[PDB]
Amino acid sequence: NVALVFSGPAYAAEAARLGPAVAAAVRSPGLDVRPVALVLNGSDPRSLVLQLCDLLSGLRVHGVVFEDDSRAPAVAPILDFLSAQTSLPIVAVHGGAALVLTPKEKGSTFLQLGSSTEQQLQVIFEVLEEYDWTSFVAVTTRAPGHRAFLSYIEVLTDGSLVGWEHRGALTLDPGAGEAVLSAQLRSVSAQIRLLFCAREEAEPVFRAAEEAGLTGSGYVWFMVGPLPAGLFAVRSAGWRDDLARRVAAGVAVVARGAQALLRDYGFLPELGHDCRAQNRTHRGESLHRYFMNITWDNRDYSFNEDGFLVNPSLVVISLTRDRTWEVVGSWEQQTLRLKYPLWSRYGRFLQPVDDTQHLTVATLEERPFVIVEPADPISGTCIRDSVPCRSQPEKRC
Amino acid sequence: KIVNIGAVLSTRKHEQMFREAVNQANKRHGSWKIQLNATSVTHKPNAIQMALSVCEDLISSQVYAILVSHPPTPNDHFTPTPVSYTAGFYRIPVLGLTTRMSIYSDKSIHLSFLRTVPPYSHQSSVWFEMMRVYSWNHIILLVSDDHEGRAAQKRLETLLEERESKAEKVLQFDPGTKNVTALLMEAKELEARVIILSASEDDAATVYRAAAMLNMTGSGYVWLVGEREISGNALRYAPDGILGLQLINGKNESAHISDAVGVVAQAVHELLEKENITDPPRGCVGNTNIWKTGPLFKRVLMSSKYADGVTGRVEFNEDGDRKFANYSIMNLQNRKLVQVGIYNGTHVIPNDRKIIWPGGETEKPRGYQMSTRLKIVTIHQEPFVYV
Amino acid sequence: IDLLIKLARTMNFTYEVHLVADGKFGTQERVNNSNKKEWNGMMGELLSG
């Protein structure tokens, strides 16, 4: 049996109707799925451990799909310990238990459908080079994982024919003061800033951003983890798939993951069927050996040894004048397909600081004086020691 | 009205003097309304049920901080784990004792934890100075491949860069090793003889037996070994010249309990000001929001200068660690661990008795062996190297 | 090789010659994982041991 656990009163209404809906949607040979509806509410860790353990003894369930409404990620470690304790593979599709957590406890089976910061950082650079946004600043403050945040920055621009440049501050303190923060933000040498900071501290630094006046239409921001115009972030289909596809996706991994051991031999692991009845829990093997060759809905869902997704479907989200989050581009397994045709510069998704100092020039092609060659197809950007020239269109050096 | 701090201990018998420690709150700082109460309970024998013995036990009694102690059974960090996850769920600061593990030193998993006992990873700081006053240049070290093993290796390499660049050869092995002498064969090919072991309490026994058959315990060899590879089965089947370390005030629960409550009681006094002093959430029936001043309270405990207890050196770095902990370098002399020095941050040698080295040699052997056999790489360049 | 014999006789050591495996002189490049650069050729066999 597969357990379906829902947290939050919002999902209480839809929990009842979701049971039979997925029973006939996906079927596997030699397996039966009996979804259940849970109405537990409250952030306290009382029902998450009493009912769940009783559920294991009650219905003898293996494989749990978890989803939450609020953006509180404090509940993820609660089941991570439980996953490593009773050897129960628990997978959460979206909600609070979706952010990547490292390191994980040894001998665990907790899985997440999310994207790490290292995976998220690489897709930002292709957005910069698409619109020729070489100038950028990397600014961050005290963060749990800022050590690898900067470590992966210098390695992206080390290679490639295109010439990049680096600039960045050290840290920002919310309690330092608006005047102090404004003074420290004056040491910049570019127009684009990449932000990686905690959610709680993100709002004060944005409120103090308008104090220094660095929130105009001439600047853009990227969020890695009041709101200035032109904000970008990556959510990895966070607002997509609605709800029916997510619960269907969660049970698909468990059903096909469980069949990995079933084809070799007929064995029913009921290790997770009890919590306190047996005083021994040494019996455990092949906890994470499986769940490495997963294919569904013409997509790849391979999972690494650590227990997080390594082949995601990233999507970029922009900001509109109506203060809404909308998908502008796309990304389909390393294709970098961007919609909204990228023609000209400083006119789309970014504007010059001074209009009067932005002027157009015209040129011709004379072999010893002006040389025109096509753009580099390897990277899709014009080579170094050259400037773009849109033939009024295409892009040429 | 009343200041109450929670704590879980090894046994109820260990709570008898804990009440005595906290009943003296009248003769402490402030002495206006603070009435320190033990509010202690013996830990569940099973660590899984500890999650069921905190919400209805600790948070229900209006606790500000929790103390977790090592169980009498030789468990593997079973006790401090559930407490940290529960305390970290409400962002209430927690501090433990006798928790010698390096997995509590990162805030990614344990956001709040202030232990007063340094982990095994700080032994490498001793090894740097211990071998410097003996004129030893480069080493070869055997390190277990796990989270604990690599913690010491990363520290030693970082410090050694400023003095003698890197080591000679770092050899790693699986923590479930059993009759693995392949890595030891190339160990006696690098003229080091300064072998430094960092295995577990039980894995080091295999190394000693494996190396004994290769006459690695004779003269000219020295062994720098941590505390974990001395006690238990490691003492038997061991070289007669181990220079292992130890801790002076370690495994002293009574002293730590008295010292732990001193800083906590003093920390409460300093927080009494005009700012937000909202009490931690009460009960575990309904509790979703997190108190604002919790992060502030944790910072106070980090910068507390308690000049009493263990020679009055109660200071904390950006993480929860002890400073200038005395180690009392130990030397094995015919099944008789004899101290040959003390450590207080700077090496001091109260050289009681004399030092015996493996093979029975009195004077300290060097860690070098010149090799007259060389291997040379050449390439095919016509005027220079024909082939 | 003629220069090698003179050094060994003067400094009293014994040698053992062997060619290179790859067939290169030496340069620094990045492995397929992360950017932890490594050497190759004659510069990568002296450092390894």
Curated annotation (Swiss-Prot), chain A:
Location of this chain's protein in the cell: Cell membrane; Postsynaptic cell membrane
Membrane topology, Extracellular segments: 1-397
Family: Belongs to the glutamate-gated ion channel (TC 1.A.10.1) family. NR2D/GRIN2D subfamily.
Positions bearing carbohydrate: 41, 279, 293, 311
Illness association: Developmental and epileptic encephalopathy 46: A form of epileptic encephalopathy, a heterogeneous group of severe early-onset epilepsies characterized by refractory seizures, neurodevelopmental impairment, and poor prognosis. Development is normal prior to seizure onset, after which cognitive and motor delays become apparent.
Subunit structure, interactors included: Heterotetramer. Forms heterotetrameric channels composed of two GluN1/zeta subunits (GRIN1), and two identical GluN2/epsilon subunits (GRIN2A, GRIN2B, GRIN2C or GRIN2D) or GluN3 subunits (GRIN3A or GRIN3B) (in vitro). In vivo, the subunit composition may depend on the expression levels of the different subunits. Interacts with PDZ domains of PATJ and DLG4.
Disulfide bonding pattern of the chain: 53-275, 382-397
Name of this protein: Glutamate receptor ionotropic, NMDA 2D
UniProtKB/Swiss-Prot annotation, chain B:
Effect of residue 193 to W: In NDHMSR; changed glutamate-gated calcium ion channel activity; increased inhibition by zinc
Subcellular localization(s) per the UniProt record: Cell membrane; Postsynaptic cell membrane; Postsynaptic density membrane; Synaptic cell membrane
Stretches of the chain found on the membrane's Extracellular side: 1-387
Residue pairs linked by disulfide bridges in the UniProt entry: 55-284
Glycan attachment sites: 37, 179, 215, 252, 276, 326, 344
Protein modification: NMDA is probably regulated by C-terminal phosphorylation of an isoform of GRIN1 by PKC. Its phosphorylated state is influenced by the formation of the NMDAR-PPP2CB complex and the NMDAR channel activity.
Highest taxon listed in the record's lineage: Eukaryota
Domain remarks: A hydrophobic region that gives rise to the prediction of a transmembrane span does not cross the membrane, but is part of a discontinuously helical region that dips into the membrane and is probably part of the pore and of the selectivity filter.
Function field: Component of N-methyl-D-aspartate (NMDA) receptors (NMDARs) that function as heterotetrameric, ligand-gated cation channels with high calcium permeability and voltage-dependent block by Mg(2+). NMDARs participate in synaptic plasticity for learning and memory formation by contributing to the long-term potentiation (LTP). Channel activation requires binding of the neurotransmitter L-glutamate to the GluN2 subunit, glycine or D-serine binding to the GluN1 subunit, plus membrane depolarization to eliminate channel inhibition by Mg(2+).
Membership in a protein family: Belongs to the glutamate-gated ion channel (TC 1.A.10.1) family. NR1/GRIN1 subfamily.
SUBUNIT field: Heterotetramer; the NMDAR subunits are modular and harbor tiered domains that function in concert to regulate opening and closing of the cation-selective ion channel pore. Forms heterotetrameric channels composed of two GluN1/zeta subunits (GRIN1), and two identical GluN2/epsilon subunits (GRIN2A, GRIN2B, GRIN2C or GRIN2D) or GluN3 subunits (GRIN3A or GRIN3B) (in vitro). Can also form heterotetrameric channels that contain at least two GluN1 subunits and at least two different GluN2 subunits (or a combination of one GluN2 and one GluN3 subunits) (in vitro).
Identification of the protein by name: Glutamate receptor ionotropic, NMDA 1
Native source organism of the sequence: Homo sapiens
Whole-protein residues included: 25 to 411 of 938
